[PDB]
Design a protein around this nucleic acid. Sequence first.
DNA 1: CAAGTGTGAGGAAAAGTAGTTGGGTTTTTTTTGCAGTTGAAGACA
Length: 164
Amino acid sequence: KLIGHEAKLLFLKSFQFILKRQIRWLITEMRFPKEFEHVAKIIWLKILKTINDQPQEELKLQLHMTSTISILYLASTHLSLPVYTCDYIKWICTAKMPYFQASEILPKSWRIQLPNYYVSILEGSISPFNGQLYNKIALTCGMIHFKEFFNSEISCQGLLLKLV
DNA sequence: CAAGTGTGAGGAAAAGTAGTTGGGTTTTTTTTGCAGTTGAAGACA
């Protein structure tokens, strides 16, 4: 039950939390060592950097259900391990991601952290429409300045194989 | 043929809050024994 800046801070925090839970199932499923884990961290460390700057009372951040996978997608692309469609289908099919419902957290309490123009909107609101999927991957790249930072973006001779 | 600024709204969701009701205490301001006695109507010198 918190409104305003600090409501945002833990909405921030919770967002922080689930992405991390997302990443570790990431490792278990793909077993792609420290590497997958740490690149993902700093990626959001980088994402956080900008959020603090336009703070004051900037509440444009609260990321969408999609921002998290865009983040993991961007980081993977760095690592260039896989593909998007395959990743998305696999994730939905096995609920590999905690993406769908936001009750996990470790919140019990973050849940009650009331919603404050936030936390309630997190975890499992809806399924992606059209580009919409990327309509934010691009934004994240925008926030990130990702292309300069990370090598070989979107590539994969593996998507071609997957496709044939 | 084609690419590019400016921008209004549509939509979602948990909890609150509405309407309609009821419950709910609350809260509350037929003589059966006795003995005596008074007053009565009636009566009298």
